[PDB]
């Protein structure tokens, strides 16, 4: 798995991304939002279950990246944004799979959002993130072997009273080509 020193460097790789995510969506939610990152090691099944059904799941990769990583966004937050960017207050979030329009709008957003991640990684590995595929069901994905360990990034999005989760999944196939380590 990982080392004691590798978990620490990874806390300062979702550094900026913690603060850049913060001031990005707050700029598009037209209000102040606080974000907090909690990192952990999990099996790939410990993660594939801890995603509610259904949910907004984006799997992505990079040019220098041999593999595929997951960008998970819980649905309560998902529709909250769709509203705000369409002249809304922040409705009650319907818990349903999104329509064509509603993803096409949000793919552009999770694109600009995912780039922010890559702007924290430019110190260790430059890559242009391009989204491979989109899905709504977590028992349908499964990119790597179900018991391969994972770097799990839990972004605590919260404002006013409401609160939600943004998750990014780095599976041990990982930057194992780059685990002949950066440091």
């Amino acid at each position: 798995k990982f080392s004691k020193e590798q978990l620490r460097t990874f806390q300062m790789i979702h550094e900026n991304f913690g603060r850049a995510l913060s001031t990005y969506l707050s700029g598009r939610l037209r209000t102040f939002v606080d974000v907090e990152i909690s990192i952990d090691q999990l099996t790939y099944e410990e993660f594939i279950r801890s995603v509610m059904i259904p949910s907004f799941i984006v799997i992505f990769t990079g040019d220098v990246f041999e593999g595929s990583a997951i960008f998970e966004m819980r649905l309560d937050l998902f529709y909250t944004m769709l509203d705000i960017i369409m002249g809304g207050p922040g409705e009650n979030p319907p818990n349903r799979p999104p329509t064509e329009i509603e993803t096409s709008i949000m793919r552009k957003e999770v694109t600009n959002m995912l780039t922010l991640l890559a702007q924290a990684w430019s110190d260790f590995q430059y890559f242009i993130p391009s989204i491979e595929n989109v899905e709504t069901n977590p028992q349908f994905v499964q990119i790597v072997p179900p018991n391969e360990i994972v770097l799990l990034v839990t972004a605590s999005v919260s404002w006013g009273e409401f609160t939600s989760f943004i998750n990014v999944c780095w599976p041990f196939s990982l930057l194992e080509p780059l685990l002949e380590k950066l440091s």
Binding site: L82, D83, I85, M86, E91, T99, I101, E102, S104, I105
Partner: protein
Amino acid sequence: SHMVQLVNFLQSEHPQTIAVVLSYLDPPVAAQILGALPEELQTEVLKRIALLERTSPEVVKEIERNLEKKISGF
């Protein structure tokens, strides 16, 4: 066919999504559709068309491209 297809379309959409679409079409075509929406959406969409404070230029013609899609005549 232009009427029936637009309705099947917006019946699925978000009360805020449905709202913006009806504000760019002229009120005739829009309300002809607003008459084919159910009880709740008829009112829920309508009170949100009230609160269209300001709209986004990129999100509209991104809907115009989610238009031009699956109805013949625009």
